[PDB]
């Protein structure tokens, strides 16, 4: 079984890349696809706690693979299943790790992102 790319974070059977570059959520998805990855899908609280403790630049928000659409009236992951118990407000919003919590923000806002690769 193959190992994580040269300068990516390794946890369980997942590879993470934290961008230094910021853009819209749509443009974030495009950068992960160009990298042969997907936006971050948080499997558990352990994975979240790891990422936060390995970020260092905790003072910036990061897009994740979670968005709210009017068509479904629900929060859906990009994999693409509905979210189960995001501290904020729901309209035409996308999720992002802002501080030590998952926050709902406008999808047009410029934010960095976390790409993930599955092993």
């Amino acid at each position: 079984k193959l190992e994580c790319p040269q300068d990516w974070l390794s946890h369980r059977d997942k590879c993470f890349h934290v961008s230094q570059v910021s853009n819209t959520w749509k443009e974030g998805r495009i950068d992960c696809d160009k990298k042969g990855a997907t936006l971050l899908l948080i499997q558990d609280q352990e994975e979240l706690r790891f990422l936060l403790d390995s970020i260092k630049e905790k003072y910036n928000s990061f897009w994740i693979g979670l968005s709210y659409t009017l068509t479904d009236m629900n929060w859906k992951w990009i994999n693409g299943t509905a979210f189960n118990s995001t501290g904020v407000t729901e309209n035409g919003s996308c999720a992002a790790i802002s501080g030590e919590k998952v926050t709902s923000e406008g999808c047009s806002s410029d934010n960095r992102w976390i790409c993930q690769k599955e092993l």
Binding site: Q20, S22, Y59, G99, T103, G106, S109, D110
Partner: protein, 118 residues
């Protein structure tokens, strides 16, 4: 001579935060230091802000009533739209691409600006 933690650029005195907050708190913080959320009046002021803000998405003194309303400074004077603001939100911040916008409750670093005066 500007106060401690503040940087002096020409006749202005600037404060670059170390910890992030929302647009309401940021505005309140600057006002307490007899300042306001950063306003750039020329290219030199904007260049300084963009250069020194480093990799910190930081709030500036630009707000909107709605996406269909014009951008205004904290003076309530309308923005000259020289550098158009990205996003369809009500509160602006500086990033590496220029100026972007988010909701009132999002956390970002801030920038306070005041005149070096007496």
């Amino acid at each position: 001579a500007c106060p401690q933690n503040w940087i002096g650029v020409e006749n202005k005195c600037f404060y670059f935060s170390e910890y992030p907050s929302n647009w309401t708190f940021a505005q309140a913080f600057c006002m307490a230091q007899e300042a306001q959320l950063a306003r750039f009046d020329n290219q030199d002021e904007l260049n300084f802000l963009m250069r020194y803000k480093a990799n910190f998405d930081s709030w500036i003194g630009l707000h909107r009533e709605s996406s269909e309303h014009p951008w205004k400074w904290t003076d309530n004077t309308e923005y000259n739209n020289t550098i158009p603001i990205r996003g369809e939100e009500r509160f602006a911040y500086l990033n590496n691409n220029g100026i972007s916008s988010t909701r009132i409750y999002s956390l970002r670093m801030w920038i306070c600006s005041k005149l070096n005066a007496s």
